[PDB]
Amino acid sequence: PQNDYIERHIKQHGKRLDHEERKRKREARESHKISERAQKLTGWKGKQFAKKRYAEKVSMRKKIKAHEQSKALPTYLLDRKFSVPLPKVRGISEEEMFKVIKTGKSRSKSWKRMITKHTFVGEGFTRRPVKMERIIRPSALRQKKANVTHPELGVTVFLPILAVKKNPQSPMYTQLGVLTKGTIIEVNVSELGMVTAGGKVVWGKYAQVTNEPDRDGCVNAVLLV
Amino acid sequence: SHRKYEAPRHGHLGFLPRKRAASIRARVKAFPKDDRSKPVALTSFLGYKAGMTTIVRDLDRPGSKFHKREVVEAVTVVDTPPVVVVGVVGYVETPRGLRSLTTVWAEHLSDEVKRRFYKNWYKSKKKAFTKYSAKYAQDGAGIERELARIKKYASVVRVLVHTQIRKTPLAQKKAHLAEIQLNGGSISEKVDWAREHFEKTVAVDSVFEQNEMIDAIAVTKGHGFEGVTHRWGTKKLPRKTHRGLRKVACIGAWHPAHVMWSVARAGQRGYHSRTSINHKIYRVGKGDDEANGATSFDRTKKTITPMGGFVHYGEIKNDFIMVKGCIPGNRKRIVTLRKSLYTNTSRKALEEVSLKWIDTASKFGKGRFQTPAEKHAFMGTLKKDL
Amino acid sequence: QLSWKDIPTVAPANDLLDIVLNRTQRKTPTVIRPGFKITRIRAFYMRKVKYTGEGFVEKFEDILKGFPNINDVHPFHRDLMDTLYEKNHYKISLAAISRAKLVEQVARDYVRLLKFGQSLFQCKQLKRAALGRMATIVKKLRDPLAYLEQVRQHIGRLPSIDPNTRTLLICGYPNVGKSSFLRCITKSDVDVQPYAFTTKSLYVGHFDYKYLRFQAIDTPGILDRPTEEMNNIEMQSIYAIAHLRSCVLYFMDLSEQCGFTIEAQVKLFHSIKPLFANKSVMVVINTDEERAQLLESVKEVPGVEIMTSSCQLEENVMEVRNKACEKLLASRIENKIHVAQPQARDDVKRTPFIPESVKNLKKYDPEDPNRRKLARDIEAENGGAGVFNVNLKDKYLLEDDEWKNDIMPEILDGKNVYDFLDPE
Amino acid sequence: AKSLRASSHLNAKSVKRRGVFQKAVDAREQRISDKLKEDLLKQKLEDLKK
Amino acid sequence: RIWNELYKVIDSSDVVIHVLDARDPLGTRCKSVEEYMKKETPHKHLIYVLNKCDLVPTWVAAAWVKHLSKERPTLAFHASITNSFGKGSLIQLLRQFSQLHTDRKQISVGFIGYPNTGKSSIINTLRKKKVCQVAPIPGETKVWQYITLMKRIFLIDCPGIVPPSSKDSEEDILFRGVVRVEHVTHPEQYIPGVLKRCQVKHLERTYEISGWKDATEFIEILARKQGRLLKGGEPDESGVSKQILNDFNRGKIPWFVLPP
Amino acid sequence: NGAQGTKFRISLGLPVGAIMNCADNSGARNLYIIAVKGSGSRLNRLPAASLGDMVMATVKKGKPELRKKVMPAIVVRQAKSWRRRDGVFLYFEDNAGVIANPKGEMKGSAITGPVGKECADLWPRVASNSGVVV
Amino acid sequence: ATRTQFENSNEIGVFSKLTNTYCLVAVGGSENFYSAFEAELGDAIPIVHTTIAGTRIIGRMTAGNRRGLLVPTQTTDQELQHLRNSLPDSVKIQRVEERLSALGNVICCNDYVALVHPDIDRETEELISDVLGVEVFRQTISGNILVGSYCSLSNQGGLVHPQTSVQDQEELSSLLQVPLVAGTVNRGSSVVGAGMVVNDYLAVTGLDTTAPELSVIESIFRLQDAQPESISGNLRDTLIETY
RNA sequence: GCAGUCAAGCGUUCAUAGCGACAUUGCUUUUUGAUUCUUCGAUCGGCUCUUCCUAUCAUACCGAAGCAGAAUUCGGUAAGCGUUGGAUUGUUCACCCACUAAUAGGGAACGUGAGCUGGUAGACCGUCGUGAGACAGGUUAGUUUUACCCUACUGAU
RNA sequence: UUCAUCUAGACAGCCGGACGGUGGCCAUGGAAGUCGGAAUCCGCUAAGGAGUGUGUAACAACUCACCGGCCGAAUGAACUA
Ligand SMILES: Nc1nc2c(ncn2[C@@H]2O[C@H](COP(=O)(O)OP(=O)(O)OP(=O)(O)O)[C@@H](O)[C@H]2O)c(=O)[nH]1
Ligand SMILES: Nc1nc2c(ncn2[C@@H]2O[C@H](COP(=O)(O)OP(=O)(O)OP(=O)(O)O)[C@@H](O)[C@H]2O)c(=O)[nH]1
Ligand SMILES: [Mg+2]
Ligand SMILES: [Mg+2]
Fold this sequence. Notes:
The structure is cut from a larger assembly and holds seven protein chains of seven kinds. Chain C is of the alpha/beta class.
C-alpha cells in the first residue's frame, strides 16, 4: 500500500523468471484459441463472440483506410404537394381498441368499454361518475407531452400537447383523443420563439405522430411546418 | 411447479427394497483384499448378541476436551464361544463371476451341524455324512484329489465353520454354518491350514484383540407392517383430515399418470440385513478366567453377566467380545464380525482403550447394586435369614 | 475515514450493461408461450423489467455509498483529494450516477403501462423499450465510470494518516536526504535516487517513542515558485504542512551537494515560514561568513532550533528524533496515575519470597544450540500438537521412582478407596 | 467443504496409510497368528491326554 | 391499494375537502397531496375543514381558522346527526361551487385526510342519517363510496392516508389516529408523550386520582384504582396504557396544540 | 467466534419464543427474541439451542433504556435434562439468560446464582464474572 | 514481563494460576502455554497441567499462596491426588465446602494478606485467618465484589480496574500495606485478574495489552532494574495522552 | 421508438436514383452526488410429498483484474449436495428483520376446465330505477358422500 | 476468379545497417522519435518515420517500417462457390 507499491516491487525484484516467455506463448496461442471459441461456445456466447469479432474487423478496416487516405448550386440553395408524412396508416378495429368490462357480482351487464391505447383527455378532465361513465380512459394511458421533431434543424423537443384534431380512424376517436399512429395533434411551440409577419407569436402548430404508442411509452411526432 | 421451499428427501433410496431378509443370518458380501505376504488369518467370526451395558473409560485423546478425563459409554456384548472348522471351499475365477468347483468336508461332524442339515431331527435316521466318512477310508484318494484340485485351481479359499450353540443358554440346539475367508498367502498353505484344522476349534482371541475396529453384519429386529410416518419419517397431518392423517396427503397440484418408486409408502419395517462398520473392541474376555467384569481400577471380583443374568438371555459362561455402541440386531441373534476391509486413517483405531469400571447391575429394573454381596450388605439381614 | 479501500469495482458502461442484462436473461425465466394467460405474460415481462431496474440501482448504490463524500470528511483529506482528482469532476460524475439512479422512473412507468398489455407482442415491445432506455442511460455514462475506476484504484492505495496524532513532517529541497532519513528512522518503502522529484507523493512511517505511537511523513518537494502557479505535487506538501498538528523538520544539507544552493534553501524556508507560525519547527544540517549569516537568518525567526548531524552516524538521528518528539509533547500537554500509599498501620514485616533457583538460573535464548528442550520440541520430535500424548506423570514427586506407572484403585465392592484412605 | 471423495484428502490419507497405521495393522497380524498357532498346540496337547 | 383509491377519488372529484383534526391540523395536513393538486390539477379547488372543534375551545378554533384562511377557505365543523356545527356554511359553499360548474350537470366532492378525522361523520351529518359506517377505530372505511345530495352534488368517501415522511416518528403516528393500539407491543413507553401533551388538571379530573409523578407510577395507580391487575398482584400496565392511548385520541382526555 | 473451544453437543431446551430470567443487576429481568447463532436450516424446525449458546434477545421486563433493543447473549441455565459426558444427567431450577456483546464480553459485571460448567469453560468473561460455578 | 497467548485468548484465567512456588496450567491440545512458562522458569519450580472438575478455567476455579492451595467441592479425588503428587509437601492443599465455588474470583491474595467476598463465613475460613496464612478482609473494589477478577495482587504492589476511586484505593492499600494503582489490560479491559497473572519476579499477560499498560505493570510490580513505582514520574504524560 | 448524420457492401445492361451492416447525434428534462425517497383504474396464495432443467445462490476446481495480505468483483467446467425460521389480511400480483455456507431461478397444473384450504335460496347500508328489480359498491350467514374393480406403487406367498 | 512480387534472387528465417541538422517547436518538476498539442522539412543515402511498439524519472537499450548479406524457386493479399 501507500503508493504504487507493485511498480516499486517490479523495479526492485522484477515480475518473475517465467513471465516474458509465457506472455509470448499466450499471444501465440491466442490465434488458435480464437478459432477454438468460434467453433465452440454454443448459443448466446457464440453470437456475442461473432458480434465482437465483426466489430473488431470493421475497426481495423477503418484504421487502415484512415492511414492510407491520410497518406451545381451555391452555398445558400444547397442544403435545400401538401401531403402529410403518413397517409394511409394501418386500420384499427373497434375490437382492438375497446376492451369489454363487466360489472356486477355475477358479471352480466357489460356496457363498459376501456380504451387500450394512449389518450389525450385535456386540461380539465375530471372523471365522470361510475354509474354514468361508459368510456374508460385510464390514467396511465394519458399523455400530456409529446416528442416533436422539426425535420429541418435536426432537432427534437419535449412539447406539451394542446389537442387532437384528426385520428384517421372513425372521428369518434378524435373526440375521445386517441393517439394512434398517423394521428394529428396541436402542440405548443412557444419554446421555439416562432413569430409571424406582423410580430404575433405563434404558440400552436400541427404535428403527426409517427409511432404506435401502445407499444412504446413514447409519443413521437413530426411537425407540419 | 417449483415447490416454493426446498427440503431434503425422506428416506434413503439405497436401502431398498425394504423387504424381509431372506435369511436370519445376514450374508457377508465382501471380505478384505488378500495380501499373500502375510500369515494365514481368518477374515471373520460368528457370535450371539447378549444385551448391552455401560462402562467408564479414561480417555487419552489429544486435541479433545475429554483429554485426560473420564467418559461414560455404552457397549454391546457378544457371546463368542469357539468356532469349529468342518470344511473348505475353493472359488475359481470366471468371466461370469466366481464359481465354486469343490467343497471338502471333515471326517467326523457334530449332531449340531447335522441338525442344521436336517429339518425334522427327532424322526430321521441321521444318515447325513455316512458315505463321506466312508470316503475318508484308507488313503482318502478322493479327499486328496479334491484338495489338490483346490491347490491347483480356485484362486481363493473359504472355510466352512459352525458354532457351539450347546455352550450358550439359547434353546435352539442347532448350529449355524458359515463360510469365512482365509486372507493369508500360498493357497497350498491355506489348504494345509484347513486340513490340519479339521475337527478343531478357533477362539476369538485368535481372530481379534483390543483396540480393533470391526464391522457387524446382522439382521435388524422386525417390527412388521408399519406406516409411512414411522417407516420413513414423514410429517403428520394436523388433525381429523380426510381419510386419516398418518400418511402423505398427496403429490401436489401437477398431474402424473403413475405412482413412483420414490413416494414413501407403507410396509415392512425391520428384519432388513445391515452392515455397520468401525466399532472398536474394548475387551476380549474369557470364561476360563473369572473377574472379567473387574478392572485394574476396580479389583472387585465379578463377571460381566449382570445380576439376574441378561434379559431374554442367560449368563456368559464363555469367551466374549465387547464393542462400543449399538450394532444391528437384537438379543438372541447371529452376528458376523468382520475386520474393516481397509486401513483406517483415524486415531480412534490407535488409542489403547483402558477401562475403569463395568456395570453388572440388574437390567430387569433399576439396578442399584453390582453384586449380591453388596445387596446383602446394604439391605442387611432379613427375616428369612435368622 | 482512513483507507477508503472497500469500494467494489466500477465496471465500464458496456461491461456493466452486459452484466445486468445477462443476469436478467439467466436468473429470471426465459420461456413463455402465446397460449398462456395474459396475466402470466404480464407477470413475466414485469418481473424482467423490475429485476433489470434493481440490478442497476444496486450497482449504482454500491458506487455512491462506497465512494467518500469529498466534503464532509476532513479539510486535509478534502484538499488532498481535490488536488489529486479535481473535486469538480469528482462531484459531477457522482451526480451523474445519482441522477441516472431515472432508471427507477422508467421501470415504474413501463410496469404500470404493462398492466394494460393485451398481447404478447405489445408486452414484449414494452419490455424491450424499458431495457433499451436503461441501456441509453448507461451508454451516456461511459466517461465518468472510466474516471471513477481510476480514482478507486488510486484512493485505495492512498495511505491511512490520522491528522490528530503525534506527527512530524520531513521537509526540505529535492535531492536532500530527508527521505532516507525516513528510511533509517522507520520502516518505509521509499526511493532515494539522486534527482529532484524521485517521490511524487506523501509517504508515511511509524515509530514508538516513550510508549507512544508517532507518525513521520515524507513529502516529495517544494520549489521557490511565487505561488500563484504551482503543481499538484507541491500543493500536497503545502496542504500537509498547513493542516497537521505536527513538528516539522527542515533539512538543509549544508554542502555543495543537492544540486541546490544554500541561498535558495534559506529562500524557500523564508517563503514557507508563514505556514510555520504554530508548527514547532526544527532545522537540521545534514557533512565563509555569508553562508553563516544565512543561518542566523533563520535563527532570528522566533520559534526555531538548529541541529547539526549526519546520515553517516545513526545515533544523532535518534537524538534529533527524540528532540522533535519532546518539542511536540510539551505543547501537546499544554493544549490539553495517582498511586496510593499505606500510612503505617502495623509493624508486621513483609518481604518477597524468591528461591535461589531463579537467581542461579540462566535466561532462555531461543537461538542457542545448547539450551533447554522445552516440551514444544519434544512434541515436534514425537508427533504434532494433536497426536502427542503427554504423560501427566513423569513430573510427580514420590518416595520410590520404580512405581511411576502405578494406578490407585478407586472403587472396591461397594465402597470408595479415597474415603477409607488415611495414613493412620 | 472438501468431500469424502476429494482427490487431495484421499492423497493425504494415502500418504498416512503407508506409515504409522500400517505398522499397527501389521503387528496385530503377527500377534494373532502367534495366538492361532498356540490354540492348535493346546488342542494337540489335550488330544495327547488319551 | 389505499393510494389507488385516493387518486381515483381525486380524479373523479370536482372539489376536494381536506379534513383536519383541530387538535393537530398541521400534523393531519398531508402537504404532498396539495402539491400534487397544485402541479397536476389546478382546476380543482382544495378547501380545508377543521373537524372535532367541540373538543377544543373556541379561541383555538378561531386562531387556526385565521391562520389557515390566509391560504385556503378553511371552514370549522362539528359532526353529529343531532347536534352539528358548520352544516349550513358548508352547504352554501358547495352550492357556490355548483353554481360555478353550471355546465357539468353534476359536481363531485371528495373527502381527503388522515384516518379517524370524521369524513364519514361529516357525510352522515350532511345527509342527516347513517349513510356511511363509523367507528372510533381508524380503518372502518376501506373503499370509496358515492353518496348523493341535491341531485347535483356527489360526495365521495375515501379511506385514510398517511404519507411516508420519514421525519415523522412512530410516536407522532400513534398520537394521530392512525393505528389500532391493540397491535403495538410496549404501549407503556408512549405515556410520557401523553403527559407531555395533556394538562395535569384535565388528566386528574378525568381519571379522578390525584397528584402523581412518574408515568410508570401513574399507570400502576390507575390500575390499582380500576382493579385492572393480573393473577397475583402485578398491575396490567400494558392494557391500561392501551386504554389510555385510546382515550387520548378518542377525546375522553381533552388535549390540544396551540398555534403561533 | 468469541467463544473458546469447539461446537459441543448438549440437549436443546430453549426454542424461539421463550422468556427466560436475568438475575444480574444490569437492569433486565427477561429475555425473549428470535435468533440463535450456529443454528441449522431445516423446513418447519425451530431454532432452539444451549451449550452456553449465544442468542438474540430483548428485555420484556426491565429498564426502558434497554427495552426496545435487540442484544446478544448466552444461556447459563436451562432446566431441561442435559447429559454430562462424565456420568450423570444435570438440570437446573430454571432458565437463565444473561447479557453480553458479540465477543462474549458482558454488559454487566457480576452474576447471581450458579452458571453452567460448560458455559463457563466456553465463555471466559462469564467465568470471571461468575462467583458460583454449578 | 511477558506476553503470550494460548488458544487465542488474552484472558489467562482460562488457563493458569501462578505464585512464587508453583504454576498450575490447564491441559489443552498443545504444550505451548506450558512451554511459555518453562522458558522463563525452566525446571526451577513445579509447572503442572490439570483440570478442575474436567474444566480448564483453573485460575478462576482455584486460589492459593506459596504456603498452600484451596480448591472447590466439585474437584474430583483424582485431580486432587494429582495435585498432591505433583506438588511438594510444603504447599498444603485443601478442598473447601462452599456455595461460592469460584475461589479465584471470590478471593484475591498474596503471601501476607487476602481479600474475600463479603458473603458466608466458615469454621475453617475463620480458622484460615491465622492457621494457614494471615489476614482476611471482607472488602469491595468500587462495588465490584469479585475481587480476584477485578484486582490483581502480589507482595510488591497491586492493580485494580480503572473505575476504582482514589479514596477507595487509599483505603485498600492501607489494608494490603503496599501500593495500588488503577489500570486496564488487553486493549481496554476492566477485568485484570483474568487478563493477568503476576508475582514477585515475573508477569504474564496477553498479546493485545499495550506498551503503556506493560510499563505500568512493570512499574507497580518492580520488574526492570529499577522501577520503584515512581517511574510514573517519568511516564506521566504518556498516560495522560493515552487516556 | 421517432427523425437524422456517416459509410463496409449491394448497386435498371445508371457513377452522380435507390437499398444499406457496424458506428453515431438529438428528444427523455437539470450538470456539483439534496431525491425526502411520494405509490395514480391488472376482470389468486398455502400446506403435505416426489422428480426433473440449468439460465449456479452456496460448497469443489480454475482464469482475469492495481488482486500486498484479508475480503470482494467479473467470468469458465459443474445440477454431486443443500438452498431456512418468523411478523404483517384498514390485504400480499408483496415487503420487513434476523439466522445462515446460501437463504438461485423455473417446469411437470395455470397452452379452456381436474387433490386438501382461504379468497344460489336469507338480510342490511350505498348508487340507479315510477316500480317489480338491477348494480360502481360494501358487510354478514350459508350439506357431495370411491378404491370393495383394472393398472401403477408398496410389502407378502 | 482477380490483382501483385520474383535468378537485376521473391516468401520464411538468421546476421548487419537502421544515420545526420536534432535533445526540431510548444508546453513541464522532468519528456531527448514513443504522457500530451500542433508542424511533419530538408540533407546524405542501398535504405533509414521529426518515428511502429516494449522500456527509462529522463537518457540508454531493444524493436518495426525500410535497405543489404547468406539461403535458391515459387509466393502474398482480396474475393466467390
Ligand atoms: N552526506 C550525506 N548524504 C546523504 C545522507 N542521506 C541521504 N543523503 C543524500 O541524499 C541523496 C538522495 O536524496 P533523498 O534521500 O531521496 O532526499 P530527497 O530527494 O529530498 O527525498 P524526497 O524529496 O522525498 O524524494 C543521496 O544521493 C545521498 O547522497 C546522509 O546521511 N549524509
Ligand atoms: N367529538 C367529535 N368526534 C367526532 C367528530 N367527527 C367524527 N368523530 C368521531 O371520530 C371517530 C372516527 O372518525 P370517523 O368518523 O370514522 O372519520 P374517518 O376515519 O375519516 O371515517 P372513515 O372514512 O370511515 O374512516 C368516529 O367514531 C366519531 O365518533 C366530531 O366532529 N366531533
Ligand atoms: Mg529524490
Ligand atoms: Mg376511519
